Design a protein around this motif. Structure first.
Motif, PDB file in Angstrom:
ATOM      1  N   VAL C  11      54.380  33.974 106.068  1.00 48.84           N
ATOM      2  CA  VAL C  11      53.923  35.302 105.632  1.00 48.84           C
ATOM      3  C   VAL C  11      55.108  36.191 105.246  1.00 48.84           C
ATOM      4  O   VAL C  11      55.035  36.899 104.245  1.00 48.84           O
ATOM      5  CB  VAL C  11      53.003  35.979 106.667  1.00 48.84           C
ATOM      6  N   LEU C  15      55.951  37.816 101.618  1.00 47.61           N
ATOM      7  CA  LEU C  15      56.298  39.226 101.439  1.00 47.61           C
ATOM      8  C   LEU C  15      57.507  39.391 100.514  1.00 47.61           C
ATOM      9  O   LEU C  15      57.431  40.106  99.515  1.00 47.61           O
ATOM     10  CB  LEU C  15      56.577  39.906 102.791  1.00 47.61           C
ATOM     11  N   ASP C  21      62.077  44.260  98.396  1.00 44.73           N
ATOM     12  CA  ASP C  21      62.587  45.397  99.181  1.00 44.73           C
ATOM     13  C   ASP C  21      61.910  45.566 100.556  1.00 44.73           C
ATOM     14  O   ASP C  21      62.425  46.270 101.425  1.00 44.73           O
ATOM     15  CB  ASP C  21      62.410  46.695  98.368  1.00 44.73           C
ATOM     16  N   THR C  22      60.733  44.972 100.747  1.00 39.66           N
ATOM     17  CA  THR C  22      59.808  45.288 101.843  1.00 39.66           C
ATOM     18  C   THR C  22      60.052  44.399 103.081  1.00 39.66           C
ATOM     19  O   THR C  22      60.573  43.286 102.957  1.00 39.66           O
ATOM     20  CB  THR C  22      58.376  45.217 101.275  1.00 39.66           C
ATOM     21  N   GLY C  23      59.706  44.875 104.285  1.00 37.49           N
ATOM     22  CA  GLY C  23      59.875  44.170 105.574  1.00 37.49           C
ATOM     23  C   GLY C  23      58.649  44.263 106.494  1.00 37.49           C
ATOM     24  O   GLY C  23      57.704  44.976 106.178  1.00 37.49           O
ATOM     25  N   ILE C  24      58.631  43.553 107.626  1.00 33.31           N
ATOM     26  CA  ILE C  24      57.486  43.486 108.561  1.00 33.31           C
ATOM     27  C   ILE C  24      57.885  44.005 109.949  1.00 33.31           C
ATOM     28  O   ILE C  24      58.750  43.411 110.590  1.00 33.31           O
ATOM     29  CB  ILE C  24      56.960  42.028 108.689  1.00 33.31           C
ATOM     30  N   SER C  25      57.183  45.009 110.489  1.00 30.66           N
ATOM     31  CA  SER C  25      57.158  45.202 111.946  1.00 30.66           C
ATOM     32  C   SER C  25      56.349  44.093 112.618  1.00 30.66           C
ATOM     33  O   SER C  25      55.257  43.758 112.164  1.00 30.66           O
ATOM     34  CB  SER C  25      56.557  46.555 112.330  1.00 30.66           C
ATOM     35  N   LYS C  27      54.358  44.275 114.981  1.00 30.05           N
ATOM     36  CA  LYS C  27      52.972  44.734 115.149  1.00 30.05           C
ATOM     37  C   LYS C  27      52.112  44.396 113.928  1.00 30.05           C
ATOM     38  O   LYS C  27      50.997  43.902 114.073  1.00 30.05           O
ATOM     39  CB  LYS C  27      52.967  46.238 115.472  1.00 30.05           C
ATOM     40  N   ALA C  28      52.655  44.573 112.722  1.00 29.79           N
ATOM     41  CA  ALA C  28      52.034  44.125 111.478  1.00 29.79           C
ATOM     42  C   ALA C  28      52.014  42.592 111.368  1.00 29.79           C
ATOM     43  O   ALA C  28      51.024  42.029 110.909  1.00 29.79           O
ATOM     44  CB  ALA C  28      52.747  44.778 110.289  1.00 29.79           C
ATOM     45  N   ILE C  31      48.942  41.653 113.106  1.00 31.21           N
ATOM     46  CA  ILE C  31      47.806  41.793 112.181  1.00 31.21           C
ATOM     47  C   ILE C  31      47.701  40.542 111.308  1.00 31.21           C
ATOM     48  O   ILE C  31      46.664  39.883 111.315  1.00 31.21           O
ATOM     49  CB  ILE C  31      47.888  43.054 111.284  1.00 31.21           C
ATOM     50  N   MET C  32      48.774  40.173 110.604  1.00 33.36           N
ATOM     51  CA  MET C  32      48.769  39.050 109.663  1.00 33.36           C
ATOM     52  C   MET C  32      48.414  37.725 110.340  1.00 33.36           C
ATOM     53  O   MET C  32      47.588  36.978 109.824  1.00 33.36           O
ATOM     54  CB  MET C  32      50.131  38.936 108.955  1.00 33.36           C
TER      55      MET C  32
ATOM     56  N   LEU G  56      49.559  41.889 101.237  1.00 33.17           N
ATOM     57  CA  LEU G  56      50.905  42.393 101.461  1.00 33.17           C
ATOM     58  C   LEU G  56      51.418  43.209 100.276  1.00 33.17           C
ATOM     59  O   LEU G  56      52.064  44.225 100.504  1.00 33.17           O
ATOM     60  CB  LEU G  56      51.848  41.228 101.768  1.00 33.17           C
ATOM     61  N   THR G  69      59.314  51.272 103.712  1.00 30.06           N
ATOM     62  CA  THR G  69      59.430  49.874 103.233  1.00 30.06           C
ATOM     63  C   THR G  69      59.230  48.819 104.329  1.00 30.06           C
ATOM     64  O   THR G  69      58.968  47.660 104.015  1.00 30.06           O
ATOM     65  CB  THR G  69      60.762  49.608 102.514  1.00 30.06           C
ATOM     66  N   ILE G  71      56.478  47.447 106.590  1.00 29.32           N
ATOM     67  CA  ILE G  71      55.036  47.425 106.832  1.00 29.32           C
ATOM     68  C   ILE G  71      54.764  47.669 108.319  1.00 29.32           C
ATOM     69  O   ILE G  71      55.338  47.007 109.188  1.00 29.32           O
ATOM     70  CB  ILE G  71      54.399  46.091 106.380  1.00 29.32           C
TER      71      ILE G  71
END
Lengths: 119, 107, 93, 79, 412, 102, 111
Positions: C11, C15, C21-25, C27-28, C31-32, G56, G69, G71
């Motif tokens: 996942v 992303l 540019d985007t990242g994951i906490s 906690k998210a 969710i995934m 996403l 940026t 999520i």
């Protein structure tokens, strides 16, 4: 005899050399084209956007933008989309005065002196 | 009567859960690629002609005439305005048929 | 000692493929993981029922394609079928 | 014409089984719209099952499976 | 209109055509994936007077296993990529051939055989075929060789060493065979994975997609009529199809194919109009990108296999471009090939594009002539006994056959 | 890294390799020529003209900013004996003011 | 002999990122059917991967529009409840600590 493209641009995408994909429409048909580099460096240069109407001399890639389609005038020339097929061979008939051939031949860029009287 | 009756088994076997009557061509090739070859040796895996050096023409799918165009929807190649009027009246089945006939984006 | 069997790296790779540019906490990520596990249970459950209704021992690409066609909504089903057929197309060569 | 086959007195009959005392004159055609989209949502899943099953008569099983999936199930058609 | 089908002939004969002079008369056979050709060699006329068994290579049996079939009458085939790749489904094809041509006395074939094979034969299939020949039928001596080079051996001016490109057009594959000093230069030979089968399948799939109103009325055995009769190959394909575009030339050159008759008239009995389709199926071997498949095609192969030679020997080895096989039957094939070759050759330079005397038969006539002329060359033939001592895949280095390569094949 | 340029030319009448000097190649480079362009070379004078891309490559992209032209139907190599008429006044005027070269 | 060193994955042969072998592993050990097709997990992985890419991308747009940026569950909830297709796919589920989409009724708005 000249090959001219003429349509509404429906959608246009460019990646990061470059490759891109462009879609064109008339009142009668729709088309998609994979663009070559020397079109990408023209469509990007002339800031073309979806809902423009554009005419392109295919042998040269100059974008004659004619206006925007009336449905994408929403949010300033507005125009109907072109008719028939997108790529037309058309005869252009052109008349050059014999003096206008004298002048083009006389300088590094002779034709300026046709207007300016410099020659 | 016959040219012979006393034949015998030469590769096909009834036992297990495997071929009773033949060896598949890809198995013949895969088991030949293991032999002690050198670059002079004429070989049945090596005779396939190259991929083309010039790019392929677009012939229109529905008529074979040269295709200046491809449709954003059906993804077929077409030559004329009445062909565009025709392809948008085809059922999805023949559209994926024409695409599969050129190993394109559907099965 | 103990295990969890999460999809986390896949996942995250997806992303960075859609939005570099985007990242994951985490906690998210929770969710995934919950989402992709639940959709897997939904599709595999639908395909299982569909195969049993059709008295088969097998689920194949057409059982799952139909199960997806039932489970997914409008344009997401059209695009999911498009990516499912593209993947099987580029795999089978 | 076919959708108007849900007759104006059938709306009144169904609503009267539904216990309602009185019907406003605007109810009818939008209620055909509700019945239409409900029918459509179950029939399309039933056809989706029938196409996987290769057949092309829509079976009682094809619609029982659509209704079972959509949580609007029925009994008496051999579930 | 379509013709009606023809099948189930009765070519049955006595024990064998024994003759004056030599007591041994060999069997002559032509090989691969379309249609058998077979017969006794029969010296007596300079042209072969009676080749026999001109039959589609297709196999069958009854649903309960009580009867089998092998002669021409869904079905099965022992081939892929023009190489034999089945056991008993091949034996029953040999059985049908020997049973019609003659059995002399006992449980073996009477006399030696010449037997064509793929441009290369994989180092299992020639062995498996020779094993299915010696143990099953006891042939006294054997001759492997290649259909295409045999058809060249017939069309040579005289019994001699020579050079050429053999442009072969087999049912599944088209092969370009450079030959030098009388021998195949197999080190740099190439093939395209396409031929008559693919063209027929393409012509089917076109007309299936064009006329869903009668998907069942069109089938391979009907495609063979529009393919082997009504189709033609372009001089320059983008030019022929451009000339095809205008309605008057279209109505002058589209071919009507009236389905078997009982909206004016045609409502269940349409005319299956073929136009550009009667070019597309021919062009597959020149441009395999009319299919999905990316390959050089019969033009860019003839470039790529040729420019790898020294500048002077190219003019020598092009001095016989020779055209042979099934697809080469198309009208305009020599004309396309010489019009194509004219672009890729050096500006003033010479070439000759020799079409076979009969592109479908000549491989058998070539095998006949080669077996008649080499009949007693016991270094050319493999003797029955040599199979017990050699690796079975073994072959003996001679004209009209593949280059040999010493290998051992284990058994366990 | 420089000596002279081999170039190959093709038409629907055959093929040649030429052996261009680097002062010709400076004009192929200035004309922005690449493999698959259709070219006219005048071997007396080094007049090199690009004439558009050969239309066998007219599908390299679906739409690209080059004119595509059919492979020439003529001979790869044409000789003519020609006669140049040139007045003494042409020699005077073409030398007396520094030439364009531009 | 021995098995192949660095043998290529079903995923990377398909051009996918999701673990197609694990999808087959879980279809078979998850007891969904007693036999399972070899292209079935390719198709399933491609669908799960597509849904993952779409959800996403919309969450990253929600983060960008929110001036972020990284999520967090909020950006996913904002994406899922803005898009009608995800909303109707995801009607029976709560995004933990994502809150709810901000909405005032027309009768509660001014004047």
């Amino acid at each position: 005899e000249t090959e001219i493209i003429e349509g509404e641009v429906v959608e246009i995408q460019i990646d990061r050399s470059k490759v891109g994909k462009l879609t064109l429409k008339t009142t009668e048909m729709e088309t998609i084209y994979d663009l070559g580099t020397k079109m990408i460096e023209s469509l990007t240069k002339d800031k073309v956007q979806a809902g423009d109407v554009i005419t392109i001399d295919k042998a040269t890639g100059k974008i004659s933008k004619l206006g925007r389609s009336f449905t994408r005038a929403r949010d300033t020339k507005f125009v109907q989309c072109p008719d028939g097929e997108l790529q037309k061979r058309k005869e252009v008939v052109h008349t050059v005065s014999l003096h206008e051939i004298d002048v083009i031949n006389s300088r590094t860029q002779g034709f300026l002196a046709l207007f300016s009287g410099d020659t | 009567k016959d040219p012979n009756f006393v034949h015998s088994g030469h590769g096909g076997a009834v036992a297990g859960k495997k071929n009773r009557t033949w060896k598949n061509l890809k198995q013949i090739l895969a088991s030949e690629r293991a032999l002690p070859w050198q670059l002079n040796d004429p070989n049945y895996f090596s005779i396939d002609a190259p991929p083309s050096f010039k790019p392929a023409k677009k012939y229109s799918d529905v008529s074979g005439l040269l295709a200046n165009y491809t449709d954003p929807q059906s993804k077929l190649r077409f030559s004329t305005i009445e062909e565009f009027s025709y392809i948008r009246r085809l059922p999805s089945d023949v559209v994926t048929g024409y695409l599969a006939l050129r190993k394109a984006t559907s099965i | 000692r103990s295990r969890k069997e999460s999809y986390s790296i896949y996942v995250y790779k997806v992303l960075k493929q859609v939005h570099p540019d985007t990242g994951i906490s985490s906690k998210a990520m929770g969710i995934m993981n919950s989402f992709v596990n639940d959709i897997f249970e939904r599709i595999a459950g639908e395909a299982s029922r569909l195969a049993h209704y059709n008295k088969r021992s097998t689920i194949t690409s057409r059982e799952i394609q139909t199960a997806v066609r039932l489970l997914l909504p409008g344009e997401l089903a059209k695009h999911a079928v498009s990516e499912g057929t593209k993947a099987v197309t580029k795999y089978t060569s | 014409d076919n959708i108007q086959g849900i007759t104006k007195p059938a709306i009144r009959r169904l609503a009267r089984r539904g216990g309602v005392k009185r019907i406003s004159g605007l109810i009818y055609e939008e209620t055909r719209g509700v019945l239409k989209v409900f029918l459509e949502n179950v029939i399309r899943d039933a056809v989706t099952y029938t196409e996987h099953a290769k057949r092309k008569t829509v079976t009682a099983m094809d619609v029982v499976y659509a209704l079972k999936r959509q949580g609007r199930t029925l009994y008496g058609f051999g579930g | 209109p379509f013709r009606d089908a023809r099948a189930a002939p009765d070519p049955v004969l006595e024990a064998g055509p024994v003759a004056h002079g030599p007591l041994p008369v060999p069997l002559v056979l032509d090989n691969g994936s379309f249609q058998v050709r077979a017969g006794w060699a029969c010296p007596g006329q300079d042209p072969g007077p009676e080749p026999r068994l001109q039959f589609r290579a297709v196999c069958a049996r009854g649903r309960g296993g009580a009867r089998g079939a092998s002669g021409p009458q869904m079905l099965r085939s022992p081939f892929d990529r023009n190489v034999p790749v089945n056991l008993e489904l091949q034996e029953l094809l040999l059985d049908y051939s020997f049973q019609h041509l003659g059995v002399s006395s006992q449980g073996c074939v009477d006399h030696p055989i010449v037997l064509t094979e793929a441009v290369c034969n994989p180092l299992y299939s020639r062995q498996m075929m020779s094993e299915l020949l010696f143990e099953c039928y006891g042939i006294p001596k054997v001759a492997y060789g290649i259909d295409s080079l045999f058809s060249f051996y017939h069309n040579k001016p005289k019994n001699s060493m020579c050079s050429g490109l053999i442009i072969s057009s087999g049912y599944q594959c088209t092969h370009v065979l450079p030959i030098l000093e009388g021998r195949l230069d197999a080190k740099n030979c190439k093939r395209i994975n396409l031929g008559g089968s693919q063209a027929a399948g393409y012509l089917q799939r076109l007309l299936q997609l064009k006329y869903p109103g009668h998907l069942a009325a069109i089938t391979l055995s009907r495609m063979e009529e529009i393919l082997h009769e009504h189709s033609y190959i372009a001089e320059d394909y983008v030019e022929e199809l451009h000339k095809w575009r205008c309605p008057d030339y279209y109505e002058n050159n589209v071919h009507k194919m009236q389905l078997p008759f009982s909206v004016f008239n045609l409502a269940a009995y349409h005319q299956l109009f073929v136009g550009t389709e009667r070019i597309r199926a021919p062009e597959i071997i020149f441009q395999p990108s009319l299919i999905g498949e990316e390959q050089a095609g019969i033009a860019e192969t003839l470039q790529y296999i040729l420019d790898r030679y020294p500048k002077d020997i190219q003019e020598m080895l092009v001095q016989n471009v020779f055209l042979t096989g099934g697809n080469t039957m198309y009208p305009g094939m020599k004309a396309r090939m010489e019009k194509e070759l004219l672009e890729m050759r050096p500006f003033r330079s010479s070439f000759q594009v020799q079409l076979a005397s009969n592109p479908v038969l000549d491989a058998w006539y070539g095998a006949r002539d080669w077996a008649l002329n080499h009949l007693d060359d016991n270094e050319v033939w493999i003797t029955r006994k040599e199979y017990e001592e050699k690796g079975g895949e073994y072959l003996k280095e001679h004209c009209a056959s593949n280059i040999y390569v010493p290998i051992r094949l284990p058994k366990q | 890294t420089i000596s002279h340029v081999i170039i190959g030319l093709k038409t629907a009448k055959g093929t040649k390799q030429l052996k261009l000097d680097p002062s010709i190649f400076e004009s192929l480079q200035k004309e922005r020529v690449e493999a698959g362009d259709v070219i006219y070379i005048e071997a007396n004078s080094g007049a090199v003209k690009r004439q558009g891309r050969c239309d066998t490559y007219a599908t390299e992209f679906d739409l690209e900013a080059e004119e595509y032209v059919p492979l020439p139907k003529g001979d790869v190599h044409k000789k003519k004996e020609i006669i140049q008429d040139v007045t003494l006044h042409d020699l005077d005027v073409a030398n007396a003011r520094p030439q364009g070269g531009q | 002999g021995k098995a192949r060193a660095k043998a290529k994955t079903r995923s990377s042969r398909a051009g996918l990122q999701f673990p197609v072998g694990r999808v087959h592993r879980l279809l078979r050990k998850g007891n969904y059917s007693e036999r399972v097709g070899a292209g079935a997990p390719v198709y399933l992985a491609a669908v799960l991967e597509y849904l993952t890419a779409e959800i996403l991308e919309l969450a990253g747009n929600a983060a960008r529009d929110n001036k972020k940026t990284r999520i967090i569950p909020r950006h996913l909830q904002l994406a899922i409840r803005n898009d009608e297709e995800l909303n109707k796919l995801l009607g029976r589920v709560t995004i933990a600590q994502g809150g709810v989409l901000p909405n005032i009724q027309a009768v509660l708005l001014p004047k």
